[PDB]
């Protein structure tokens, strides 16, 4: 090459896109308790996991901002403050849990009229870095023949969740619409692996079906031009 | 040097004027046939009439069929050479006239919308390659290009004054948008001529004035590549 | 304004039939106002602007017959002086001799024009006469340019289109 | 010429009253095709960067880079616009060629239900860098078609103020 | 597309029954467009991008019998030239001699490809003939790579999935 | 270097043997295109059969229609270039054979006198330009030239032995009667091939042997003149 100033790596990775969507129904049947918990599950969606699966060894912090509005784009003066529970502590199950009274958990409160919120959280996972693949048995216990009582629900791998409540004596009477954007701050990778070509059947397993697919069949016949 | 009975040249003491000190040269930055290219052939003669308004040609579209090297270059899109144009008007002491000659880069062709319905059809196949016949002007304000004639002075131009001299030469530099670009896909330039003095003369004079077009590559090329 | 008279617009004819009359009457030199100056580049550039100043130059070349003899004179009346009723009032202003042996090396410069001003007029210095066997009509070409001393001061929020 | 762009968006009422409504703007690269129907996948694309700002803050200043695959924009083209090896037929997508422009923006309203107020928005445009090479004349007569400079049979004249040239 | 024909996909067979016909017809070299290039890594990388340029190289190794003799030739037609109707039009372009004593040291380089372009075609240079007691069918392996001069200019907001 | 899928060459460590120390060189006594000449194109493949007796071609008559520079050279009679010829036979361990290759200058063509009446007619127009089809031998003692096959050893020759090597190269010098002579009027030379071993093999082997003709100008030319 001759000049590599315009070819800067800055544009090679930085792309903001919609990743999550959280709804707050005022009544419902799926969530009739009026509160929901959303763990950070990158593997939940296929379209984002395709970019991430090219990477094997990574550790980084996160930055999120929250916006709420109406389907017509009108703005309303509502204030929220967000509280985070470390992943080590178990997540609340019922409203009468002690997680809402914990004062030892740090919190940061910002308004909406101010410039957009910029918050960062450190890497608190006890491991060194996240591992997307594991050629073995995920449990790190001395027992290698039985299974844990909490099989299926293993929050020991994720990074926790957030709790949302409304300020006021009575419950809020407006549902909100919120969209979330995700990004990486540092990019460092070691072992390059191929991505996926066919579609996914299950959310947590890459298994396939008996109807095989082909990358392309554009050429009617190879014998002719 | 020329096989035939015509080896006419334009003296040896011409007056070349450089423009802004950027005379054409060789770009050989990093960011043998020389026998048959130096020979010039004279194009056929043409008869100028009273009703003539002018002509225009597309380059290098005319040389595809004329030149010997033109035929085998139809599949080799590369071409790069500068040209020297000499204009002279053979007239006696009983003729009056003035000539305006200039080069207009990217001579765009604009369609016309006539009749009660402003809708135009596709150009026919025969008019796609007019050859030596060319075309005929309809609206000479725009010269089939939408441009007022008076404002062409922004481009390099020269005034033909018959008071003192008769033959003049203009030099233009080769311009391109990319270091390497196709020649058979992008039009290089064109030639424009406009008559200023209508042909006036008395009986006994010559009613026909020859029109001379001279092509001579003042800057030699190496060329030879796949483009 | 006829369609078939389009090409003759670019010049103005002159004939020997007219005798000591009046050739052309250039209007007040103002690019902002209407007239010949609206076609020029500077006048269009001034369409967003108010105050202008600079120098003016005119060049003339003679395109007559090879045997003809005569003298032409082009003069610009300085400011203050009204339109020339007589050639005597024209001679007091700056005049330049135009011989037929020299074609275009003649240069006339107006020192300063702003925005009231002077006027320029062109008369027939003498009638162009030719013997038998010569054309009775000729044409004259004129030139106009500006010097380096043109400047701009104040921008205007005015658009002449449409 | 090649340059970046800076835009700000203002919305209000014909009486000048202000309302508390928030919008966030998402941009699709020109390479990807523009959406046609509501059920397109363009609204779910997370890989496209976005920037969100409010209205009570100082006016928004946003800049986008030059992403066109060419070196610089070309307003004139003395030839055939298509850059394909075929030079005798025409592409299936003739007439609609988004390969020359710089893309568009998608606007949606935040909330479960659709918005019930129409808005009035005006846009201002500017250049940041000015650099030109080949000077060409401008246009004098009016335009007949939007994408073609063609003219009609009713010719016009720059001025006819002088009643007659013979007199003063 | 049959299930039990899955393994044979990775090669293409060649037989002596065909005589001076046509081996393979590579489509227009464009990673963005459909064809063999969608499986490659660079073509997927270009799915968010518009303009690309670089050099192309091809490598071929010969896997015939130990006693066979013959000559193979692989040539790339330069741009401008249409699809080769005759071998004479193929020879005017760049060609490389492929001997059976040298396996893979042969390197062909296309100087520059961008986005219109040239075409590549493969004919039977000569029929592969063997005596009795030899297999009547063989297979050929091909290679394709890019040089260091590949660069990117403009990002695109386009996603090919799904 | 070659547009396509064939850039086959004959190694880089060939064994060139000079003849009598008169290797071809430049005659520049007194008593630039160098880009498109150095590229070699591979001729089309041909299938050898059991009944084939041989072929012969006239030079440079074959290149008039094949080469790109061949077409525009039909009116330019000048041509001067040496050639390097590489011959190789792709065979496995179950094939036997031997090849005799030589060049015969001024390969004169003799007519035949058959039938009860020894009178021959003029050759037809179609057979004047056989192209790639060529001709078929009738009396192979004379090879259509009146020359016994055994006595061709007087000219430069080489023996193809398959015991050790498979590919051989022979170099011949350009010879002319005059310092400047027409090329399209006087035949330069020709190629002769004779089969020594009839094709013998057992079942399961390859019954077809490729025939390779390689043209490569080992001595570059300037050229460019009126001749």
Residue numbers in the entry:
A (entry chain A): 72 to 296
B (entry chain B), F (entry chain B): 7 to 37, 40 to 235
C (entry chain C), E (entry chain C): 60 to 174, 177 to 223
D (entry chain A): 129 to 296
What's in the article?
Particle conversion from N to empty capsids (E) follows a predetermined protein unfolding process that can be mimicked by incubating the purified N particles at high temperature. Accordingly, native particles of the WT and K162E were heated at 52 °C for 1 h to convert them to inactivated A-particle or empty E particles. Heat-inactivated particles were reconstructed using 2D class averaging and icosahedral symmetry-based 3D reconstruction. Particles then were classified according to whether they had Coulomb potential at the center of the particle. A-particles showed density, but empty particles did not. The WT A- and E-particles were resolved to a resolution of 8.0 and 14 Å, respectively. Even at this relatively low resolution, the A-particle matches previously described structures (EMDB ID: 5465), with a cross-correlation score of 0.918. The A-particle capsid proteins expand outward, the virion RNA genome becomes reorganized, the N-terminus of capsid protein VP1 is exposed on the surface of the particle, and VP4 is lost.
Enteroviruses particles are composed of single-strand RNA (virion RNA) genomes encapsulated by an icosahedral capsid of ~30 nm in diameter. In this study, we genetically perturb this equilibrium in a non-enveloped virus, enterovirus A71 to determine its structural basis. We isolate a single-point mutation variant with increased particle thermotolerance and decreased efficiency of cell entry. Using cryo-electron microscopy and molecular dynamics simulations, we determine that the thermostable native particles have acquired an expanded conformation that results in a significant increase in protein dynamics.
